[PDB]
Structure 1
């Protein structure tokens, strides 16, 4: 019914520098740089500075927006929160090999930017997956048959994990019985 004003605000930690211009949000922190283009959202992004204290706040509001339009405010706020978390602490995804008979052989290429799977269900085909920008994959030593994906962008790390998972789908078999694959087992922060 076109609510007059829907508004939400988030606090910005002092250790992160943020810039907003034409719905283009730049996020800066010790771990690096992250960028996002929110031009597709018909919202008003404002950065509020408290002169006495100096803490930052990001306010996103929609004027005369419907429920569908208003649903994007929290989405944008969560995206900005994810950017802050990635630039301060980083993101760490953990994947585990599951197999019944044929152990899965993983070969990390140079730079920890690609992986090779060779013995999935005793298959002679070699599966190739390339890590996305800013995401590295390493073989865990303390945990048996575990892959660790680290990066600054949550979306890129999660998409790399999804690519690894989907590259090892079982076919022409009852997947309930044939449970072999590589699956995400834990989502966390590097720091």
Structure 2
């Protein structure tokens, strides 16, 4: 039982943070993210004058410490999102049949069509507040982006799932739509 264990998360420059009872809310250039931590025991305290926020845990086994670290990481991610959107660059790879990747509904909902040539539509709606753009630069790829690292990632995963082919040898058929690069803007 380690009496005190701490962690220091440096808030960036153009970020309006506001925790209360582990209900952290961060605002900035891109989006206002709110994400509660009221399932682990933790007195996350804010310093507004200086930068940084301190996550601190009294007692608790290594589990608690781990949780604290996780929390800190999450906070960092949130901060990053609000400063600069997360940009999951998803390249679609095909063998024979080119995948038709039609974005609709204000760059939410990406209709995927002609995956291994089946003439049937795969709908994959994005989570709350996460734009799905297609390539300006290269030909194939798809940018998924929008502040909450969790949500964009989730969206990407969903997209991937929507593609992945069923009863065949998956080592042979490499066709699909995969996360190339996790980045920021």
2:135 matched residue in structure 1: 140
**Number of residues of Structure 1 aligned to a counterpart in Structure 2:** 185
Matched residues in 1 for 2:83 and 2:51: separation? 16
Moved over 3 A (4+): none
**TM-score, with structure 2 as normaliser:** 0.96
Q: What is the Cα deviation at residue 9 of structure 1?
A: 1.2
Q: How does 1:146-165 map to 2 (within 5 A)?
A: 146-165=141-160
* TM-score, length-scaled by structure 1: 0.93
**Aligned counterpart, 1:175:** 170
Q: How far is the alpha carbon of 1:151 from its aligned partner?
A: 0.4
Q: What is the CA deviation profile of residues 17-62 of structure 1, one whole-angstrom value per residue up to 9, with x for unaligned ones?
A: 111111111111122211010000111111134xxxx322211111
2:63 matched to which residue of 1?
68
* Aligned counterpart, 2:119: 124
Report 1:46-61 matches (<5 A). Answer: 46-49=45-48, 54-61=49-56
Q: Residue 12 of structure 1 contacts residue 55 of structure 1 at CA under 8 Å; is this kept in 2?
A: no
CA contact (8 A) 1:18 1:26 kept: yes
- Farther-moved stretch of structure 1 (90-99 vs 10-19): 10-19
Q: For the residues of structure 2 that align with 1:150 and 1:141, how far apart are their CA atoms?
A: 15
The CA deviation at 1:116 is 1.0
Cα deviation, residue 14, structure 1:
3.1
Change (3 A) 1:142 1:48: closer
- Say if 1:20 and 1:26, in contact at 8 Å, map to a contact too: yes
In structure 2, the partner of 1:36 is 35
Q: Do the aligned partners of 1:13 and 1:55 also contact (CA within 8 Å) in 2?
A: no
Describe the SS at the equivalent of 1:122: coil
Structure 1: gaps of 5 or more residues: none
Can you list the C-alpha shifts for 1:52-111, whole angstroms capped at 9, x where unaligned?
A: xx3222111111110111111110111110110000111111111111111111111131
Whether contact under 8 Å (2:9, 2:75) holds in the other structure is: no
More strand by share: 1
